[model samples]
Target: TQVPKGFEKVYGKAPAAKAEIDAVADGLAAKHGGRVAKAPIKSRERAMQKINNDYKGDPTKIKDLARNTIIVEGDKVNTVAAELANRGAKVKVIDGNADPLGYSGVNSTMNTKAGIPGEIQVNSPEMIYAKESEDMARILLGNDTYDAVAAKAGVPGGQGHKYYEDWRVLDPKSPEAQAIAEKSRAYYDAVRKG
Candidate 1:
């Protein structure tokens, strides 16, 4: 994954791309598009809070008890969850105790009785892979300096993992190299998610 040097300073951080921000904006815009002109979040916050609280207080909340894995009991909870979904709130009901997989199989963007649902700002697959590679490079290089970094880590590869690893020898710092590092590593990490 290629990343510009000090990308966090330049672009903030992973997942701060225009696409990621637009997705959030679009979602918020779609939910509260009617209002002519006002702070989008401020306008939506009350609505979100209203439903968030209502959903929480309802007795039909699902209970996911994990004995060995997970146990989810009660059709009422499921019904409530479906109702929330109908109302534009994402909801997930997970019984980790019944399923040994734990939260691994859980769905995203859910606002269930299990807890107050919050937004998970996910980076595009690109961001994650970049982060993983950054971590890997950091781990390999004892020092942030190029000479010391290469001495310890090796050159980063250009073509693929091999080129990324080769960069350790070259001591990656160029704009192109950094971009490649950021991209390749981030992409790899996204794909690695199991």
Candidate 2:
């Protein structure tokens, strides 16, 4: 697939930026008593979707092309977020920890000393649980068929997947997505193990 306009420029900076961010994430996760999920480099298709939907095909505007999601306890979120700031991250609390849907986390966007952008999602476990549960349900059922159930549960529809833009949530099961996810070579485990 052809790289989206200037995506290569942004993604080219991913490996080094991600390495730095993983160091930060591993340290914070260790000190704060939390677990970090495997944060992959955003897939090519998702990167294109983000550029089209959020930046009008301008990859220069993407702040989260390389990102991490750290799951800390609900009470420790702010402190962790503060520490992230102390570590020089430009942090923003996007949702409340007390939110009923548990979509709670800080969007920690930071630039490396050389100015490559990376993002960290500092979330409560509740938040990740809610998201993964919903993702599981959506993958098990077709989006068109699942839309009604989602609306009844107060969730909106039409939020399509990267490969399944036309809404094929289950048929072939996104083998490409597995490869994209496993491609994140940011050895956070090695960092944490230290």
Candidate 3:
């Protein structure tokens, strides 16, 4: 697949950074008791969709073609940002948490020692569950259609897909629609209660 201009620079530097960030994430997992993983390389599909539609095709702004996710235990999460900096994330946190997903954690938009840009998303167990559930639901239901519904309902389909998860809104209240909405609220309730 063809990528926009300037994407190669971001892509070229990604592997070295991931190698380092993975070590940091694994270290955090040993100390904090949660999963240590990195999100997949941003596929060509999402990259094109994201930049072509959202950023006016500015590939230089690409920071997350690949990144680390340090799943912190709910109780152990408060220590993450400091640890992220101490562990070599060496960047400002872009967000406190993705609370809109019914959970929140820390996020640091990072770059490596050589200036390779990337990200670190730290979140708790319940938040991870909510995210996984939503992702599975989207795939089982149908990727583009599911997003189109959410997008039509006021959430941007691509980037915002992970947010207002499980289709919180739909024009028609059909049975599956009702089920999806109910599940969405139920999960939100689940995360909040914890």
Candidate 4:
């Protein structure tokens, strides 16, 4: 059978399904069994609930980028990992440096609502804020990609896509996004009174 663009082959793939599933299951069990047991399992759900409840009390705090200059925010990572643990994620934090998704923008340009019909304006804090806000908002909404973030932030699709691509060239699958997702979910969870 034929497939579509942007997709790899699936039918009759070299690896058998049973073998793949077994490998994945074994890996999960082996890696997670003891760790999962050691995690605050009984406390896991409760802890996550507490964190989520706490997160809503302060969205700006949760969403804030330290110093308000860096594109990727670091303050949110610890908050994220703790929440993950609360959600019963059976993994060791191993210090705060173990970020799964690397997110930090050092010398990248943020895309803004384009200038007023070619009025030629400098990049304002508002511009960068809007761009980063869009990125974070996307993360908060769980779009999970810069383009998805762009769509939620209301950036023009084509232009947003280009800037997002460039931002990703510097750092992809950003921890910033993940952190935002964690907090966003937490906030929503709180809202639901879950």
Predicted structure with the largest lDDT when compared to the true one: 2
Pairs that clash in candidate 3: 97-105
Q: Which residue pairs show collisions in model 2?
A: none
Between candidates 3 and 4, which one is better according to TM-score? Answer: 3
Q: Give the range where candidate 1 is weakest over 10 consecutive residues by summed lDDT.
A: 62-71
- RMSD to the native, candidate 2? 13.8
- What are the per-residue Cα lDDT tens digits for candidate 1 across 66-116? 001111112233443453356454545554234222211222243323232
Q: Per-residue alpha-carbon lDDT of model 4 for 1-194, expressed as tens digits?
A: 22222112221221232233223333332442211111111132332343346454322212111001111222333343343345333323332123222212122111112210000011112223333445543432234444533444332322322334444445555645555444433332232231
> Candidate 2 residues 20-46, lDDT tens each?
888888788889887655466888788
Estimated TM-score for each candidate: 0.17, 0.61, 0.63, 0.18
Clash totals in order: 52, 0, 1, 0
lDDT (Cα, tens digit) per residue for candidate 3, span 1-93 = 456777667667667867766777778767876666665667777876676666677775767766877765566766877887775665543
Evaluate all candidate structures by whole-model CA lDDT and list the values in order.
0.31, 0.60, 0.59, 0.28
What's the lDDT of the predicted structure labeled candidate 1?
A: 0.31
> What clash count does candidate 4 reach?
0
Q: Model 4: residues >4 Å from true position, as ranges?
A: 1-77, 86-102, 105-164, 167-194
Q: Which 10-residue window in model 3 sums to the lowest lDDT?
A: 152-161
